[PDB]
Design a protein around this nucleic acid. Structure first.
Ligand SMILES: CO[C@H]1C[C@@H](C)O[C@@H](O[C@@H]2[C@@H](C)[C@H](O[C@H]3C[C@@](C)(OC)[C@H](OC(C)=O)[C@H](C)O3)[C@@H](C)C(=O)O[C@H]([C@H](C)[C@@H](C)O)[C@H](C)[C@H](OC(C)=O)[C@@H](C)C(=O)[C@@](C)(O)C[C@@H]2C)[C@@H]1C
Ligand SMILES: [K+]
Ligand SMILES: [K+]
Ligand SMILES: [K+]
Ligand SMILES: [K+]
Ligand SMILES: [K+]
Ligand SMILES: [Mg+2]
Ligand SMILES: [Mg+2]
Ligand SMILES: [Mg+2]
Ligand SMILES: [Mg+2]
Ligand SMILES: [Mg+2]
Ligand SMILES: [Mg+2]
Ligand SMILES: [Mg+2]
Ligand SMILES: [Mg+2]
Ligand SMILES: [Mg+2]
Ligand SMILES: [Mg+2]
Ligand SMILES: [Mg+2]
Ligand SMILES: [Mg+2]
Ligand SMILES: [Mg+2]
Ligand SMILES: [Mg+2]
Ligand SMILES: [Mg+2]
Ligand SMILES: [Mg+2]
Ligand SMILES: [Mg+2]
Ligand SMILES: [Mg+2]
Ligand SMILES: [Mg+2]
Ligand SMILES: [Mg+2]
Ligand SMILES: [Mg+2]
Ligand SMILES: [Mg+2]
Ligand SMILES: [Mg+2]
Ligand SMILES: [Mg+2]
Ligand SMILES: [Mg+2]
Ligand SMILES: [Mg+2]
Ligand SMILES: [Mg+2]
Ligand SMILES: [Mg+2]
Ligand SMILES: [Mg+2]
Ligand SMILES: [Mg+2]
Ligand SMILES: [Mg+2]
Ligand SMILES: [Mg+2]
Ligand SMILES: [Mg+2]
Ligand SMILES: [Mg+2]
Ligand SMILES: [Mg+2]
Ligand SMILES: [Mg+2]
Ligand SMILES: [Mg+2]
Ligand SMILES: [Mg+2]
Ligand SMILES: [Mg+2]
Ligand code: NA
Ligand code: NA
Ligand code: NA
Ligand code: NA
Ligand code: NA
Ligand code: NA
Ligand code: NA
Ligand code: NA
Lengths: 205, 134, 113, 108, 57
RNA sequence: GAUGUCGGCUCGUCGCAUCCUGGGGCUGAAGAAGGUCCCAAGGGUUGGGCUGUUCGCCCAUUAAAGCGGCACGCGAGCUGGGUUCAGAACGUCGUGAGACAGUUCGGUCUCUAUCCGCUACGGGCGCAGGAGAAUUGAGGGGAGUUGCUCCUAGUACGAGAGGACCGGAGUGAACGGACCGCUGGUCUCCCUGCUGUCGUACCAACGGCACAUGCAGGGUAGCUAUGUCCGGAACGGAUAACCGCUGAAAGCAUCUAAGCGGGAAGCCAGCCCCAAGAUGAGUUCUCCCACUGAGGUAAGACUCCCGGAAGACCACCGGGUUAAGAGGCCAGGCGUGCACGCAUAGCAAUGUGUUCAGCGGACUGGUGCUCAUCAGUCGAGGUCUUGACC
RNA sequence: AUUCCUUGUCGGGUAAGUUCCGACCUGCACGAAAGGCGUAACGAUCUGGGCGCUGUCUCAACGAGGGACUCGGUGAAAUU
RNA sequence: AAGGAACUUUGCAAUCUCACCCCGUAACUUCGGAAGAAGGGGUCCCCACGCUUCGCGUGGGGCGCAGUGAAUAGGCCCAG
């Protein structure tokens, strides 16, 4: 249900009680509400929400027009949510509590054109027994005269990375209201300064 | 870590000097004796982990002789072990303690500092024979 | 990935003898034309070299001599150029791209002080 | 991906100075760390490690040091977070004369 | 040679392939000094200016 | 006028006559452990000794270490151990040249993909105006394993010993996704040390070559599993074997013909990702608009430049002087670990002080010192019919 | 190196050995100049075991350089 | 990193080893040899003294992780 947008700032050490908890700092800047998607007026229930602030000199006339309807301030990023529909704007306070589990999603770092050993784990071949197919290079791709063809959606070299990724059940260690900061036990995908979306625990234990 | 084929030093007077790993188990000690393994993989024996192994070089006059298949518990790895406070421990050599199906030491005493995940793993008697618990 | 920090065109001794040779050249001649890439690569190296030499301490000089193996030039940068560049924050080097070439079809450019 | 105007360095410091702890000026030579050991159910033990510092890795929360002891004819290195809450105090036993920041040669 | 093609290719196909080979026309500018057409962010190869005059005519 | 042979390695996918988990009936099923049959292919199905082996036996484990198919799958993917080339030898048949139910040592496995097929990524056009951005989801893929312990409870059960289904909690293995804070790896010139030789006239200090880092020690960012974080599920609908309710034909009986219920790791949905070229091309917010006789133009974008945790090229993101984008510069962090020079001590090699020194790639900020100047190209005036509304 | 039956039987080494070593014997089909048996030394020979060491493996990572990729210049081939 | 032949037809390949001095060196043997078996130690700089000259020996002292400091450089053994 509820959630917000922020920036991955980094990972650091942090003891809680008597144990060393690795955490990942996230800036959940205040998020304005720019549009209310009513199912009646649209077709589904949702809320549009903005993040990084932009200079009006950089904002398209149309986009300015959009922002004027609610009249907050031009922002660089907009996204939507579900079942979320409160009043005012979207600060992580009251939203997330320390101890609550959360689904943290973002765009991974991408690795470009990675082989199969990297991409799909694979296993490649013997490095000593006399080859020409060391490191990677896959084995075969099919069978033979039967379906003389390779299966749709199979394991080959490709673009690894740049994917939407959602990690589930992360613990909210600490929350600094006013500094608009939040700490999350463990690692979140994507790079520092990356966009992250922190959503309520969807289907949890 | 620990894995089969991997020669260890014996931290006890069970008779055995150096023993080679035969297979890594899943240290199922508790309740009555030692229990059946939490699986047939596990590729590395951590500390406080029960492994099976063969005696390779043992001393003349002792409870255990060369060629003997026997289970032992790992007391000292060169791989580093991370404690929950955040600290870290590691020993210059890898050693174990030969035991029996009840998990008790075949020797009369232990030689050298034993880990401490051993206490966690409920290896009370080992910790008993042990000089220090680092 | 590949999120490092420098350029390479050949090996390790190379990029060096290069940056050095070219730095020397520019310092000596005040402006040279070269490939826009080689120029880009030279800019910061040489800027930094002015800043070293821009110290006056015999140390700073003996530092500079590690790169500039030409004495007349070390003296130039040391006693003439550095001094002059004393009031300006940092780095007076600029690049002007001329145009494409005929031999290999590579865009050329001028680096100068 | 987002391009906010904000110093992240300072941001991290802010959430890390609350977990930073300053120790005696050691660098070479020996040390005795008196550590608590309360993970024994209820009883709280105290053990001392005394050895030769050989590591000054990190800073802030992440800062730590590696000390090496020979205990019962067997080599032993420990690694301590300056800020570990299972560490009471640390004392310099004596200072040492060395020419580099590591000492990974004391192992042979 | 393992890398041999089965049949010769058709004029049609062999041209469809080439439907991505058209060079882009250099977008040229008018030089505000010697009214000659030059290459953006470069130096007018004619008069030699670029905000005041740098290269030798 | 050629369909390359065994085994392995690599990579898969499918059948069900099901090795393990799941649900059942029956028992010579007390319990616990089993036997047998029926339903059920979601996932899983370990590592080693010998042998070319496929098999098979053995060591040590496991819930389990299933059986087959795909040209006994897979050599324009690898190997070349086995087997039908040329050498040699033994046994052996033959007078011989030679031969094989034999055994043995040795013996070249061919850089470029046209088309289809597959993985990644762009260009065009379409989607009845030209544009910026937010999206529903028809559909499609991924995922799918499982042990042990504790509680229930030492209860039901049983002479005893032994010892539960159900339910409720913890912790592992292997696997996968992400991540780089920790632990470590690497870090091809970031710092230091060392040797021989050559040079900067010599001394001192340095540079080069000894690798495509001379050698050694260490190491930031980045990248990285052996490190860490998380996941498999709950709920729900319809079912399989099977188990029941009401209940006729056999005015008894009966899960069955009408009707209904319960019930599997399976199916559908749920979870993660893609997805309007879903040519039936969808929805919402906002902007410029009613020129001119194909072309000036608006909104808007492109080219060009400077870069980037984006990347083969394209593409994607940021910035482009109303500027903090990169470099430089400043400060700081971090790495190296005490510079040159001078002074002192010593016959000297060295030591000590100045000196928490000096040097410096990637890190974190600040600052208009440099370059992003100037300018060009492209880009709407929105078909028709029917219906409704003022 | 003659072995078929056969991975023969026992012992040695190994946690586990079809090959290897030592014996025995039923030598399918050993045998004294197509020499029998043994032998120090020798061997880029063939077989088995051990020590040390290691990316050969568990299991891959990082780094470098030369190509692969881009632009300009020159521009083939088998095949069909 | 940890492990160290688990790889595999086979340690294939690639490591370890590596010069010169000193100590020391098995079975077996045709007494020549096996042998450089194996294994261990040394190795730089300065000063003084000594000697047979480029050096070397002895003693004392100094520096580094390391002193054939870079290059050239045997891995060994048992058995058939
Ligand atoms: C049915 O399909 C088969 C039929 C078979 C009889 O023949 C094969 O093809 C043969 C060929 C590939 C050779 O394969 C070898 C090894 C082997 C293991 O099989 C893989 C077999 O060997 C055995 C079993 O002992 C095999 C007998 O022989 C190959 C290695 C070469 O020698 O390549 C060589 C070299 C690369 C060249 C480029 O130097 C040239 C290509 C080649 O030679 C010459 C001299 O050029 C070429 C010019 C030529 O003469 C040819 C055209 O006839 C091809 C050959 C006949 C066919 C595929
Ligand atoms: K480190
Ligand atoms: K005859
Ligand atoms: K769907
Ligand atoms: K290698
Ligand atoms: K070309
Ligand atoms: Mg094929
Ligand atoms: Mg077909
Ligand atoms: Mg070189
Ligand atoms: Mg044909
Ligand atoms: Mg053919
Ligand atoms: Mg069936
Ligand atoms: Mg039962
Ligand atoms: Mg073998
Ligand atoms: Mg067949
Ligand atoms: Mg086949
Ligand atoms: Mg062969
Ligand atoms: Mg012949
Ligand atoms: Mg040969
Ligand atoms: Mg093609
Ligand atoms: Mg699906
Ligand atoms: Mg992964
Ligand atoms: Mg870091
Ligand atoms: Mg000279
Ligand atoms: Mg000198
Ligand atoms: Mg030279
Ligand atoms: Mg030379
Ligand atoms: Mg050279
Ligand atoms: Mg190095
Ligand atoms: Mg993992
Ligand atoms: Mg430099
Ligand atoms: Mg900066
Ligand atoms: Mg036999
Ligand atoms: Mg035996
Ligand atoms: Mg005769
Ligand atoms: Mg010869
Ligand atoms: Mg073996
Ligand atoms: Mg591999
Ligand atoms: Mg690489
Ligand atoms: Mg090591
Ligand atoms: Mg070793
Ligand atoms: Mg094997
Ligand atoms: Mg070899
Ligand atoms: Mg060398
Ligand atoms: Mg050699
Ligand atoms: Na270089
Ligand atoms: Na299956
Ligand atoms: Na097996
Ligand atoms: Na199969
Ligand atoms: Na080929
Ligand atoms: Na080539
Ligand atoms: Na249960
Ligand atoms: Na035997």
């Amino acid at each position: 249900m509820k959630g917000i947008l922020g920036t991955k700032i980094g990972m650091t050490q942090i003891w809680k009680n008597d144990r060393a908890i690795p955490v990942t700092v996230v800036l959940a800047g205040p998020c304005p509400i720019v549009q209310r998607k009513t199912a009646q007026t649209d077709g589904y229930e949702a809320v549009q929400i903005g993040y990084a602030p932009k200079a009006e000199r950089k904002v398209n006339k149309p986009m300015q027009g959009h922002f004027a309807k609610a009249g907050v301030a031009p922002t660089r990023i907009l996204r939507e949510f579900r079942g979320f529909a409160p009043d005012g704007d979207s600060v992580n306070v009251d939203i997330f509590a320390e101890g609550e589990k959360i689904d943290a999603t973002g765009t991974s770092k991408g690795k470009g054109t990675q082989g199969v050993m990297k991409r799909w784990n694979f296993a490649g071949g013997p490095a000593s027994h006399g080859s020409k197919k060391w490191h990677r290079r896959p084995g075969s791709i099919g069978q033979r005269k039967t379906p003389g063809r390779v299966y749709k959606g199979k394991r080959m070299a490709g673009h690894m990375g740049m994917e939407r990724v959602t990690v589930q059940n992360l613990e909210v260690v600490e929350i600094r209201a006013g500094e608009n900061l939040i700490l999350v036990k463990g690692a979140i995908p994507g790079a520092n300064g990356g966009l992250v979306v922190l959503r309520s625990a969807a289907k949890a234990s | 870590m620990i894995m089969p084929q991997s020669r260890l030093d014996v931290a006890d007077n069970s008779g055995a000097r150096e023993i080679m790993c035969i297979r890594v188990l899943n240290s199922g000690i508790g309740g009555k004796g030692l229990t059946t393994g939490g699986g047939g993989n596990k590729r590395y024996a951590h500390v406080g982990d029960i492994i099976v192994a063969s005696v390779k070089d043992a001393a003349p006059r002792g409870a255990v002789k060369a060629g003997d298949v026997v289970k032992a518990v790992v007391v000292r790895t060169s791989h580093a072990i991370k404690r929950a406070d955040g600290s870290t421990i590691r020993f210059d050599r890898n050693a174990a303690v030969i035991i029996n199906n009840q998990g008790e030491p075949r020797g009369t005493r232990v030689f050298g500092p034993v880990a401490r995940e051993l206490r966690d793993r409920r290896f009370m008697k080992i910790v008993s024979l042990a000089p220090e618990v680092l | 990935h590949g999120k490092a920090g420098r350029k390479l065109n050949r090996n390790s001794s190379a990029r060096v003898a290069l940056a050095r040779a070219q730095a020397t050249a520019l310092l000596r001649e005040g402006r040279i034309q070269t490939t826009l890439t080689k120029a880009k690569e030279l800019r910061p190296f040489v800027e930094q070299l002015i800043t070293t030499a821009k110290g006056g301490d015999l140390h700073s000089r003996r530092l500079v001599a590690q790169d500039i193996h030409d004495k007349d030039v070390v003296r130039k940068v040391m006693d003439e150029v550095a001094p002059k560049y004393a009031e300006r924050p940092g780095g007076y080097t600029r690049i002007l791209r001329v145009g494409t070439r005929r031999g290999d079809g590579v865009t050329m450019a001028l680096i100068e002080l | 991906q987002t391009h906010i105007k904000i110093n992240r360095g300072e941001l991290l410091r802010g959430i890390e100075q609350d977990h930073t702890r300053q120790l005696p000026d050691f660098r070479p030579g020996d040390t005795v760390r008196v550590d608590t050991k309360v993970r024994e159910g209820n009883r709280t033990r105290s053990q001392a490690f005394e050895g030769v510092v050989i590591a000054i890795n990190g800073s802030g929360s992440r800062k730590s040091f590696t000390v090496r002891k020979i205990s019962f004819g067997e080599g032993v290195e420990r690694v301590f977070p300056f800020a570990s809450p299972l560490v009471n105090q640390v004392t310099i036993v004596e200072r040492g004369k060395v020419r580099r920041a590591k000492l990974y040669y004391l192992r042979e | 040679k393992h890398p041999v093609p089965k049949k010769k290719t058709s004029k049609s196909k062999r041209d469809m392939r080439r439907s991505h080979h058209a060079l882009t026309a250099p977008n040229l500018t008018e030089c505000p000094q010697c009214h000659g057409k030059k290459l953006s962010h470069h130096i007018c190869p004619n008069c030699g200016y670029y905000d005041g005059r740098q290269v030798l005519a």
